[PDB]
Amino acid sequence: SAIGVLTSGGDAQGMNAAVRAVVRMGIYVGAKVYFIYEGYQGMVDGGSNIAEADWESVSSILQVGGTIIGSARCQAFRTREGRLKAACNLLQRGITNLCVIGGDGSLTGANLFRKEWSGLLEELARNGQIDKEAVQKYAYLNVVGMVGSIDNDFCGTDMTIGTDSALHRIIEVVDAIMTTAQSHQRTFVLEVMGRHCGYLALVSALACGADWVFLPESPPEEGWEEQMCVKLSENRARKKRLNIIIVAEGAIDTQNKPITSEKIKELVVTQLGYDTRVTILGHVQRGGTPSAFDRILASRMGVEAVIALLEATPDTPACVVSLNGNHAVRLPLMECVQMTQDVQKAMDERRFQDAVRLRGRSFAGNLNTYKRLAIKLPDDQIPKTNCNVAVINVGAPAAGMNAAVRSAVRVGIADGHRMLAIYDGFDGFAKGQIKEIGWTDVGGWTGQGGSILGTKRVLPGKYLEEIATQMRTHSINALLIIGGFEAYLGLLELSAAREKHEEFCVPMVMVPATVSNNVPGSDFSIGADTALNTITDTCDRIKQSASGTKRRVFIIETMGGYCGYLANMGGLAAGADAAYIFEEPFDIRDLQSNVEHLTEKMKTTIQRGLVLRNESCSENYTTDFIYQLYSEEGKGVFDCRKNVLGHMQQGGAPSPFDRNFGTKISARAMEWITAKLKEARFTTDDSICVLGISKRNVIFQPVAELKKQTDFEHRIPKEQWWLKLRPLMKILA
Amino acid sequence: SAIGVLTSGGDAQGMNAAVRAVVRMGIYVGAKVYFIYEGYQGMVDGGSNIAEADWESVSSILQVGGTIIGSARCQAFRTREGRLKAACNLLQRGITNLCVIGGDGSLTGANLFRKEWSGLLEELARNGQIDKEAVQKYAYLNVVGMVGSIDNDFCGTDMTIGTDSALHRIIEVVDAIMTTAQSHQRTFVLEVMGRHCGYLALVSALACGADWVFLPESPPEEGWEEQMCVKLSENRARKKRLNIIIVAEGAIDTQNKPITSEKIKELVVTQLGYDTRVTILGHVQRGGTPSAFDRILASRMGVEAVIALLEATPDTPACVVSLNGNHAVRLPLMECVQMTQDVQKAMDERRFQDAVRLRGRSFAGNLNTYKRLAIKLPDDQIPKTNCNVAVINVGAPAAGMNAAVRSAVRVGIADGHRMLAIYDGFDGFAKGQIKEIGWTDVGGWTGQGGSILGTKRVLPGKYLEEIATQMRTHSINALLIIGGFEAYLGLLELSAAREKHEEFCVPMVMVPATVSNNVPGSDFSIGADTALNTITDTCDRIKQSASGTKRRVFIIETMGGYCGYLANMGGLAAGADAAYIFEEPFDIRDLQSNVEHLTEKMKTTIQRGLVLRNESCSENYTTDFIYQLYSEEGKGVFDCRKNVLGHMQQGGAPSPFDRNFGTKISARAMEWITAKLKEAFTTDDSICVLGISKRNVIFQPVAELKKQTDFEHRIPKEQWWLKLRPLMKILA
Amino acid sequence: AGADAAYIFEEPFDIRDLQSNVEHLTEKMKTTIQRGLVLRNESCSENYTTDFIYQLYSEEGKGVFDCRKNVLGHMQQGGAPSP
Numbered sequence A: 001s002a003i004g005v006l007t008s009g010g011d012a013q014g015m016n017a018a019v020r021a022v023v024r025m026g027i028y029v030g031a032k033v034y035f036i037y038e039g040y041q042g043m044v045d046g047g048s049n050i051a052e053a054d055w056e057s058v059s060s061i062l063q064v065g066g067t068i069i070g071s072a073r074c075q076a077f078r079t080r081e082g083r084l085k086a087a088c089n090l091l092q093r094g095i096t097n098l099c100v101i102g103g104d105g106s107l108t109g110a111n112l113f114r115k116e117w118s119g120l121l122e123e124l125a126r127n128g129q130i131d132k133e134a135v136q137k138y139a140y141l142n143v144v145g146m147v148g149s150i151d152n153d154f155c156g157t158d159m160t161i162g163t164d165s166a167l168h169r170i171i172e173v174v175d176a177i178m179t180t181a182q183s184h185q186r187t188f189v190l191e192v193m194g195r196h197c198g199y200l201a202l203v204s205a206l207a208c209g210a211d212w213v214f215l216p217e218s219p220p221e222e223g224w225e226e227q228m229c230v231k232l233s234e235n236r237a238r239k240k241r242l243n244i245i246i247v248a249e250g251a252i253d254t255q256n257k258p259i260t261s262e263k264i265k266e267l268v269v270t271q272l273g274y275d276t277r278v279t280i281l282g283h284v285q286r287g288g289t290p291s292a293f294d295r296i297l298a299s300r301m302g303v304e305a306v307i308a309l310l311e312a313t314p315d316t317p318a319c320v321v322s323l324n325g326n327h328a329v330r331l332p333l334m335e336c337v338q339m340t341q342d343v344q345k346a347m348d349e350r351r352f353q354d355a356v357r358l359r360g361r362s363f364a365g366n367l368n369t370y371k372r373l374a375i376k377l378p379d380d381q382i383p384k385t386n387c388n389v390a391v392i393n394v395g396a397p398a399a400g401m402n403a404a405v406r407s408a409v410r411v412g413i414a415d416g417h418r419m420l421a422i423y424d425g426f427d428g429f430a431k432g433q434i435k436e437i438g439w440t441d442v443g444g445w446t447g448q449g450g451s452i453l454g455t456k457r458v459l460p461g462k463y464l465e466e467i468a469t470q471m472r473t474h475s476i477n478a479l480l481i482i483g484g485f486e487a488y489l490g491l492l493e494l495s496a497a498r499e500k501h502e503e504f505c506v507p508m509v510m511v512p513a514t515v516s517n518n519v520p521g522s523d524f525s526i527g528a529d530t531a532l533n534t535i536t537d538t539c540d541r542i543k544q545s546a547s548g549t550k551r552r553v554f555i556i557e558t559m560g561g562y563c564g565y566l567a568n569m570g571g572l573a574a575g576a577d578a579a580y581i582f583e584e585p586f587d588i589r590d591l592q593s594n595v596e597h598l599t600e601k602m603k604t605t606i607q608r609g610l611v612l613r614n615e616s617c618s619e620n621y622t623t624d625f626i627y628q629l630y631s632e633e634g635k636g637v638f639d640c641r642k643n644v645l646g647h648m649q650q651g652g653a654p655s656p657f658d659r660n661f662g663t664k665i666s667a668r669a670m671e672w673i674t675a676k677l678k679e680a681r682f683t684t685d686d687s688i689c690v691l692g693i694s695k696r697n698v699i700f701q702p703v704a705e706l707k708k709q710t711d712f713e714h715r716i717p718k719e720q721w722w723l724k725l726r727p728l729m730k731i732l733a
Numbered sequence B: 001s002a003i004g005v006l007t008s009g010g011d012a013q014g015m016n017a018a019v020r021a022v023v024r025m026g027i028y029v030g031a032k033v034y035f036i037y038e039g040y041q042g043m044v045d046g047g048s049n050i051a052e053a054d055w056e057s058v059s060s061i062l063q064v065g066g067t068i069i070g071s072a073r074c075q076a077f078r079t080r081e082g083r084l085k086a087a088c089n090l091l092q093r094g095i096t097n098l099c100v101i102g103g104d105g106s107l108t109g110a111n112l113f114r115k116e117w118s119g120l121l122e123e124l125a126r127n128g129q130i131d132k133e134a135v136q137k138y139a140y141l142n143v144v145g146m147v148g149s150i151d152n153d154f155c156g157t158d159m160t161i162g163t164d165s166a167l168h169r170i171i172e173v174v175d176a177i178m179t180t181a182q183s184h185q186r187t188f189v190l191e192v193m194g195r196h197c198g199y200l201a202l203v204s205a206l207a208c209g210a211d212w213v214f215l216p217e218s219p220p221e222e223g224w225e226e227q228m229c230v231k232l233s234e235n236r237a238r239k240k241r242l243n244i245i246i247v248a249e250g251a252i253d254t255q256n257k258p259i260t261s262e263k264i265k266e267l268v269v270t271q272l273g274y275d276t277r278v279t280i281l282g283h284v285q286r287g288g289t290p291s292a293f294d295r296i297l298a299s300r301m302g303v304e305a306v307i308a309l310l311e312a313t314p315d316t317p318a319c320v321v322s323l324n325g326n327h328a329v330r331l332p333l334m335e336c337v338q339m340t341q342d343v344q345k346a347m348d349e350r351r352f353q354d355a356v357r358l359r360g361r362s363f364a365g366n367l368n369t370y371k372r373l374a375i376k377l378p379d380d381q382i383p384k385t386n387c388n389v390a391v392i393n394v395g396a397p398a399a400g401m402n403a404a405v406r407s408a409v410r411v412g413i414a415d416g417h418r419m420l421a422i423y424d425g426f427d428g429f430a431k432g433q434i435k436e437i438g439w440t441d442v443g444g445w446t447g448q449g450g451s452i453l454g455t456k457r458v459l460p461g462k463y464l465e466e467i468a469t470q471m472r473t474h475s476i477n478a479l480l481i482i483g484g485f486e487a488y489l490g491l492l493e494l495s496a497a498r499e500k501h502e503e504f505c506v507p508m509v510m511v512p513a514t515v516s517n518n519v520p521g522s523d524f525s526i527g528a529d530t531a532l533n534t535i536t537d538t539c540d541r542i543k544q545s546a547s548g549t550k551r552r553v554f555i556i557e558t559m560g561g562y563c564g565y566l567a568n569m570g571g572l573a574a575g576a577d578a579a580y581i582f583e584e585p586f587d588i589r590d591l592q593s594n595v596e597h598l599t600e601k602m603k604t605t606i607q608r609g610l611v612l613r614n615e616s617c618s619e620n621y622t623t624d625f626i627y628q629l630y631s632e633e634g635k636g637v638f639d640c641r642k643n644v645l646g647h648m649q650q651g652g653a654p655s656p657f658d659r660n661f662g663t664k665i666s667a668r669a670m671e672w673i674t675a676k677l678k679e680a681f682t683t684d685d686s687i688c689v690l691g692i693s694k695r696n697v698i699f700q701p702v703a704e705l706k707k708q709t710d711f712e713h714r715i716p717k718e719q720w721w722l723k724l725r726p727l728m729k730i731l732a
Numbered sequence C: 001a002g003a004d005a006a007y008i009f010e011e012p013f014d015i016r017d018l019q020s021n022v023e024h025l026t027e028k029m030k031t032t033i034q035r036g037l038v039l040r041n042e043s044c045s046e047n048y049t050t051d052f053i054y055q056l057y058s059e060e061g062k063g064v065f066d067c068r069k070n071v072l073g074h075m076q077q078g079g080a081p082s083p
């Protein structure tokens, strides 16, 4: 059949990429796809608001905020008179497959429209349409929705398209403003979006280590005014030169009265006398460019949406398309709309703990983790073990390392250990560059790129005797490594050295940090998102500059070593025409065929090309080799330029996703450490682990069990979850 | 011989680099430098608020907003009681050389303090001072000021440290917001800083082609409410999908009553019914990273400040350090403070045209240009010549090109020409890809990267006959080329072809656009700032890497061809340890020396290194050669990595400086064209480059530039920035 | 072959050593034997390659002499074995 796609409601960054994926996948599968402009308003007006879409019509859209086809509150669609016209215009062009990208209400109205769709019986009773067309274009209206929203508002979905982007906007402002708050001191109250949902405010507060945060779901609890001011004064006594307070638009006390940012300014000015400013971030949070995450999320969903449409039968209920635990799923639409309204109900009825449950387990996670790192119980009240736990960074620098260290340390001190910081990886370890570290020592770290402790790729196998000596000297009871494949190898070497050295017979756990994302036992690694955004950032600027002539193709080398994750996913996000990687062999025939494709592409109006090459994807087919092939076989048609991105892809500042990934998983790692230490008063495979992300949830996997899942020769995992996405790039280009 | 440096007042991006330049230059010249924390508050409290600074204490500061040593409104310093303590604490450590980095008032209070400094006679009359210390630490207080402020507030100075950066912040928001104003037809009123000075609001409005702007210096004039709404409705009739109104905090009508953003929202909502939002940008404008311009400006000034201090004698009055016409100068501080208050006085007394003069010639320029491009007189009222004037882009794409075309076109239509757009450089010219272009056709262009008309390096010499034919066919009366060295060569070829072809006997002028900044006759070129900012960003990240690993040195190749501008100035802004360029020959001895310096640097705590190499700086000493040298000689101490940036370092959307440079100089070029047409075949002086030479913009005949040009390496012979080479070595 | 230098792995050389041979050959060019011959074992140094040395000599010889480089290659296995 035919597929109509529209964007309705508040706009979110990534709507454009969704539309693109729906048009491209629809055409690829041989459907016809129409744009419906201006949300449901276009559907009501009909005429030229419905226009068939070709391949070319959704190029240059990917990297652009908002929607190229428009959203619109449409009142007429709230009336049967309006919905009648809508059905009429859809039948007028044979569209009974509908893809609505929008928010909580947009989706609510789509659900209603499916149910009423045998309002073609009404159009029959008038001059609307022929008798048999009530049967052909039957009561079978096939509806699939995608949630576009910065709020992480909807209940079916783990993530909504636009949240990551908006969070980039929020943290861009927060990082910017920090520098003016140090100089001056100054306490800054910032007002973020979330009239009804606090997700954005919470994940912002986490990503900037904010000093306090206000959510509608979890009100402050009586006697917070004193309790907040006590914390702020403690900060000035710690010589912290600023405070950041994050406040959701719809913040509230435990009796549903608003807590406004101006009310917080007056409390701080009144009680503490500090110099204080309010910033109302506003519609910037809907602006800017889609982050890599939102582009890849939206892309995966557009594709799944179109699949869900075609697989649908008149029996299958309308669904919403979502990524839950990094897997595409269809959820019944009616039930999803219902559960979201329940959350609002719980709040209205002062059942706040309910409102938090109803938001989900991950929402409670962010919240709870935030508290642990934001508030410290006075030393008196944290009793606890006389255990020394060490934190270290191993491998190349990776954005998020500092956030992870901050989390581990604070969680460990909260758990009542003494925390030791080991400097310069195993280098420093061997040279006993070890010093105790405290709560304040890691203040300010969340948003710092690189590694403050310092990192080195050097492995510990040659320095076992020296390293063991330091563990003895410093009475190190356990170890937390934050790092890449080198860290993994470090654990295996220390595991084997246990027999020769008792000092290693302690619990050791690692959390993965590397721009490459090549650590076995985790689908993701701290810092890869930052590099994906850097690559995406870079391609955007490349398309921006030299618009006019075109007939140019850019070959761009990416990091990763043998791991193709960056090349592949950055290729998706940047809408690359090809991404060459080690994990999928290619021969000269493959290259010549892409070249011939791009040569035909240059006959269309999209006279540009973008080709990524993983840095170690082929010993013979180098970046130069491919540049030379493409240059030569393009001679009449196009030319090329090459860029080796290089070390910039480690990041300036870590992206929000890498900060919160670092923060959260490092905390989960320390919990595990303290639990292992509690069991004494002691060494097998299960006390040395990688803690990574596997599909739905985080799990501690013994290094012994990962050897068989590892390619040691190329330093990547054997099965890698993202290889199932390879068909997408070809389709979506 | 000791120097105190402090930051006072609103913080500005680039203060850190200034402090860095003052500490590094001070030490380089063998002075001792003390930090004074928290602006004048630190000076009042004394004690540990004053602390000596070493080399290492100002590393990693360059690339960071605000001030590492703090600013602080300090009321106490507004009182004699407070100023008495301050002097006491300065004498307590022997500091009578003072460098105050701050704003309007900060410098006002420094001036006052110098004058009152024989308030040591008061301290004597109490137990403050020994008698002879009133004489040793004499009435000789040596004060030098630098203006750190986003406001371009001060009168002595052409640019204040922080304006460019704040303008990046403003335009980052504006460009961000543009994509959400898509959906529907939202009108955005944005409230920028400028409580008394409108500069920031004006230059923002210019850089985003704003639909209206409110300045305290130039109030709207009565009956603007209708006149504004007429303009906004005209836009919706032109199908423009948004309006952007820029409003200075201290905006005012002609009777000094405030014009608030909420008042503008209500007018637009009330009169036109459009969906409308207000954004109060706020302290974001002081945040973020110092732009390349501010880092280099601050750096140049810190160095000159310290020089001005040491050259000072008890005779020489306190001065403020400034870059005027791209040259360091000292201006008397007292007189500079006085003139700035005069501006405020002119406004308070409703002499607004005076307030604009007093701000300076460049302020009038931005303003007047903005009007010409924002408001169009109805076709009826612009009469004018039946001249067709063509606009073209020649050379590699350069950020700003689109802004320049927008400006030329609109200024030409305002001047009443018919404007012709020539597509794909001389390629399209030869193939007659020529079409008339209008006011609305260039709407939205200011912030667009690349070239919408299209650009090609191809020269016209082989297609003279075809090109001439198109000039005849389309009755082209004059030509404006926006482009790089290729455009310059294009003018020379056409100049020579005049005898063979009458069609070229018309006025032709070029404005320079290239990332390289290698066009003879101009100290700057449209697009170089955009690239500098990209390199700076990139180098910052690279050092961040190098600092994580430790004992690492990066060798990084940069663009420019034989032109060392980007390598050199990006090196300054990134705090590079070295920048190798064509224009300064270096031998193996020079390389070995930098290696030895970095080897000693690795004994300090800043165990990182950053080395830039211009891409065509030496045929033998390649990027690999240098990487191999450093790697081998560093074997016990450090390692290296190399990155070849590649032409992506040009960046994307033009930076605010390149948008306004494009806009302004292209308008000045059209003025010249219409004036030449009005005087009516021709001579050397009707073919020109319009570039920036030191103080002012000048039209220089291409014939006169041949002798100033290196045609073999396509760079100018004398290049102004080579005098900055000592800085990088010093400030590293 | 009466070479002016032969760089080999078994005797480490640094940049000072190279610069000194270059200066020697530069003075040699003031005599009547205005030629020079430098051999480099193929794996004598990871950083100081054949190109590196060619580039050093070329640059520091600019007023005095120029260079050419030849990588002999597999011909050295021989045509026919020598007696």
Ligand SMILES: Nc1ncnc2c1ncn2[C@@H]1O[C@H](COP(=O)(O)OP(=O)(O)OP(=O)(O)O)[C@@H](O)[C@H]1O
Binding pocket: A008, A009, A010, A040, A072, A073, A074, A075, A076, A077, A078, A079, A102, A103, A104, A105, A106, A107, A108, A109, A110, A112, A149, A153
């Ligand atoms: N109950 C409904 N019945 C019919 N149409 C509806 C209904 N609710 C919403 N719509 C249509 O959906 C459009 C978008 O809804 P809304 O304004 O709620 O956007 P949204 O992004 O879903 O916002 P939110 O996330 O706050 O609910 C409306 O303009 C209206 O045309």
Ligand SMILES: Nc1ncnc2c1ncn2[C@@H]1O[C@H](COP(=O)(O)OP(=O)(O)OP(=O)(O)O)[C@@H](O)[C@H]1O
Binding pocket: B008, B009, B010, B011, B040, B072, B073, B074, B075, B077, B078, B079, B102, B103, B104, B105, B106, B107, B108, B109, B110, B112, B149, B151, B153
């Ligand atoms: N008239 C004055 N006499 C003494 N000190 C002054 C005076 N004006 C300002 N200062 C000093 O400078 C500080 C305030 O500077 P101000 O608030 O004017 O900031 P500025 O950045 O220098 O100027 P601008 O307000 O234009 O950005 C005060 O705390 C005071 O210490």
